[PDB]
Amino acid sequence: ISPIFQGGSYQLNNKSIDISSLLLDKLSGESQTVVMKFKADKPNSLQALFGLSNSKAGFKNNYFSIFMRDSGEIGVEIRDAQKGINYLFSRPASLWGKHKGQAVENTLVFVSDSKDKTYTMYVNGIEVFSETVDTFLPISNINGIDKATLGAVNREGKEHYLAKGSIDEISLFNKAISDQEVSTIPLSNPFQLIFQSGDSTQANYFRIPTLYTLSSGRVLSSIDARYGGTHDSKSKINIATSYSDDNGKTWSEPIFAMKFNDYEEQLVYWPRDNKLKNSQISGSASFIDSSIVEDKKSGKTILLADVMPAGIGNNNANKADSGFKEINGHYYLKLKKNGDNDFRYTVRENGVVYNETTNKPTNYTINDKYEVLEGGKSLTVEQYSVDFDSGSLRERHNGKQVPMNVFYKDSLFKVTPTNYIAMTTSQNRGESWEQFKLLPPFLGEKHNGTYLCPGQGLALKSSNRLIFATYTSGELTYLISDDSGQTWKKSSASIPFKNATAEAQMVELRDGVIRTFFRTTTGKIAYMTSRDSGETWSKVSYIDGIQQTSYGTQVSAIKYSQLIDGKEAVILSTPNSRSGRKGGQLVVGLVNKEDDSIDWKYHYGIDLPSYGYAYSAITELPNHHIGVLFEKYDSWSRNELHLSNVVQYIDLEINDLT
Numbered sequence: 318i319s320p321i322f323q324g325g326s327y328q329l330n331n332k333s334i335d336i337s338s339l340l341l342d343k344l345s346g347e348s349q350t351v352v353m354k355f356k357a358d359k360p361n362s363l364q365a366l367f368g369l370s371n372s373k374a375g376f377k378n379n380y381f382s383i384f385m386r387d388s389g390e391i392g393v394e395i396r397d398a399q400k401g402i403n404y405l406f407s408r409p410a411s412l413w414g415k416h417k418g419q420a421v422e423n424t425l426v427f428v429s430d431s432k433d434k435t436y437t438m439y440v441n442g443i444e445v446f447s448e449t450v451d452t453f454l455p456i457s458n459i460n461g462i463d464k465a466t467l468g469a470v471n472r473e474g475k476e477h478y479l480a481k482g483s484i485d486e487i488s489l490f491n492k493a494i495s496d497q498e499v500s501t502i503p504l505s506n507p508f509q510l511i512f513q514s515g516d517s518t519q520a521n522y523f524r525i526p527t528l529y530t531l532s533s534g535r536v537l538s539s540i541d542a543r544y545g546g547t548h549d550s551k552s553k554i555n556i557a558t559s560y561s562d563d564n565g566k567t568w569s570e571p572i573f574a575m576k577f578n579d580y581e582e583q584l585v586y587w588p589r590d591n592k593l594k595n596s597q598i599s600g601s602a603s604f605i606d607s608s609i610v611e612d613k614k615s616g617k618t619i620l621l622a623d624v625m626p627a628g629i630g631n632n633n634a635n636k637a638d639s640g641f642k643e644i645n646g647h648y649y650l651k652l653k654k655n656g657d658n659d660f661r662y663t664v665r666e667n668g669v670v671y672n673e674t675t676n677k678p679t680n681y682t683i684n685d686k687y688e689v690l691e692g693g694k695s696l697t698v699e700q701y702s703v704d705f706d707s708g709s710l711r712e713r714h715n716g717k718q719v720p721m722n723v724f725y726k727d728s729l730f731k732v733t734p735t736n737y738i739a740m741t742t743s744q745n746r747g748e749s750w751e752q753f754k755l756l757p758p759f760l761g762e763k764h765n766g767t768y769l770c771p772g773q774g775l776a777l778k779s780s781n782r783l784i785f786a787t788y789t790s791g792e793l794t795y796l797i798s799d800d801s802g803q804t805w806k807k808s809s810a811s812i813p814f815k816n817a818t819a820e821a822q823m824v825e826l827r828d829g830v831i832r833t834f835f836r837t838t839t840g841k842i843a844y845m846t847s848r849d850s851g852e853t854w855s856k857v858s859y860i861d862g863i864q865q866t867s868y869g870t871q872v873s874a875i876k877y878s879q880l881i882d883g884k885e886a887v888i889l890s891t892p893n894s895r896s897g898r899k900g901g902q903l904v905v906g907l908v909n910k911e912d913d914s915i916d917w918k919y920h921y922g923i924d925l926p927s928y929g930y931a932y933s934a935i936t937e938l939p940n941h942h943i944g945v946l947f948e949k950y951d952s953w954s955r956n957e958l959h960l961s962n963v964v965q966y967i968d969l970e971i972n973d974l975t
């Protein structure tokens with residue numbers, strides 16, 4: 318079908334443009350699609366892009382509008398006072414503002430479908446909301462419509478919600494165009510997606526991106542595939558990965574690096590209302606926060622992540638129990654058997670389950686997938702699915718059987734309800750992953766596992782040493798391996814913080830010199846230095862010149878391979894704001910060779926200061942561009958929970974940053 322209306326080059330400068338004569342006599346039938354290509358790099362706090370209204374006195378609540386906020390939110394209102402209808406649909410963090418110094422051309426598509434009674438909004442190729450209603454209100458059937466407006470809504474002859482921006486193209490169709498059709502509309506996106514709703518992971522949500530450039534030139538990314546909305550554990554979360562062989566132009570279909578099957582992989586639209594949004598999958602095991610390094614020695618890629626047993630998260634994990642019994646030099650995974658109130662068992666060599674109370678072996682063994690065997694045979698549990706059919710979250714058996722895992726709720730033998738760190742490896746650069754193995758405890762029998770710092774581990778240039786930063790109360794705990802991850806030891810570095818989420822990332826400044834940058838509770842990013850290849854660590858200092866909130870945000874960090882301004886360069890990625898997770902920046906620092914101090918010389922704004930930017934991943938692509946994969950939303954805000962396709966990837970060049 319053809320647009321009944323098509324116009325462009327509309328400058329919105331706090332003055333509505335009336336297009337009533339061009340549009341009103343052509344609105345026909347009860348279904349409409351609006352396609353709008355627009356820019357808004359300096360929007361007012363709340364502004365209408367498009368409006369259809371009854372403009373007469375006494376009918377100020379009879380209008381349809383497409384609006385946006387300076388937070389990046391997009392939405393519509395559909396109101397008819399005589400029909401008693403006041404629909405408001407919206408989603409935070411739906412828009413781009415600027416990219417590489419220029420206003421981004423957003424592509425917006427809104428479908429009002431009478432036949433299915435559904436209102437669906439797409440922005441930049443992403444469906445941000447789709448709402449079906451009992452009583453449908455066609456946008457052209459609003460009682461007394463007599464004005465079509467750009468850059469405002471006309472109410473009682475007055476302009477409301479005045480917009481600043483530009484509508485470069487707007488088209489209206491007297492049809493609800495299909496999802497298939499929407500997919501054919503040309504986009505001008507400054508970003509691409511690696512992980513996305515509906516892909517192979519079947520997670521509707523993603524969080525905690527990573528990026529790492531392998532020696533082959535392949536770029537690898539890992540991520541939390543989060544099923545129960547965007548909530549941290551407890552939940553159902555798997556670790557997924559994808560790789561690019563063409564400097565980030567295209568990405569492979571995701572696979573799992575670490576997964577559990579106690580709950581079904583379900584694509585679920587998690588409720589965003591104020592009654593149900595804290596609904597949380599509470600009976601599932603999960604992985605959370607992954608980190609990647611490549612080992613020169615073996616050529617293996619190594620991925621670590623936190624492991625959470627069923628129903629466990631960092632809020633309810635036992636802080637005073639490692640889950641391992643130390644017996645003469647060795648650490649054995651403790652198990653509790655159904656019926657017992659204590660942990661009377663351990664897993665010894667060859668997976669044998671040993672009764673600690675009789676000092677004798679049982680006929681149970683644990684396999685390499687942490688599954689339970691009895692006399693060599695696989696025990697099973699019934700899998701769970703989740704639904705909101707009853708108006709609240711329900712977790713229930715679905716009739717499918719899966720291998721019994723010691724991390725599961727229904728298992729005969731259960732691990733200690735605390736957090737662990739697991740490792741997996743890949744021999745083919747991310748095409749497949751090994752079964753995970755638990756790392757040993759590093760802080761004794763009576764201390765929970767440390768928390769993995771999301772992002773990259775560090776492979777030292779002049780040795781085969783591998784380092785993964787972790788944090789716990791009062792210290793950073795670096796996990797160090799010199800034998801391709803076969804064995805590990807800790808190096809503790811005290812930090813003057815009680816129970817801080819001290820997410821840390823490292824760069825090798827020069828041979829044997831490591832600087833770690835980390836999140837704090839002070840509003841400032843901190844750092845410490847090793848000249849020991851990680852053996853010992855300096856006192857803590859702070860970067861003055863970048864602001865975080867009181868609660869802080871993960872910071873990603875790389876050492877650039879090329880000189881900038883004749884100096885060695887470190888690039889940081891972080892929100893730069895004392896209010897929320899927004900105002901994302903790359904910050905380029907130049908290293909002063911005399912004291913290893915860094916002058917933070919250039920700040921590049923990823924998008925508008927008011928637009929969302931949370932956890933992030935950066936890596937130098939093999940062609941010396943910078944790849945950035947980041948959460949484009951405020952992942953702290955309780956208004957921006959459960960958003961799909963907000964983890965996005967961009968390509969930048971150094972000249973863009975300087």
Ligand SMILES: O=S(=O)(O)[C@]1(CNC2CCCCC2)C[C@@H](O)[C@@H](O)C1
Pocket residue numbers: 528529530531773776875876878935936937938939940941
């Ligand atoms: O120097 S490495 O530590 O092996 C690494 C890769 N360096 C190449 C050097 C050549 C250009 C691309 C980046 C940097 C980290 O951010 C990881 O991406 C791995």
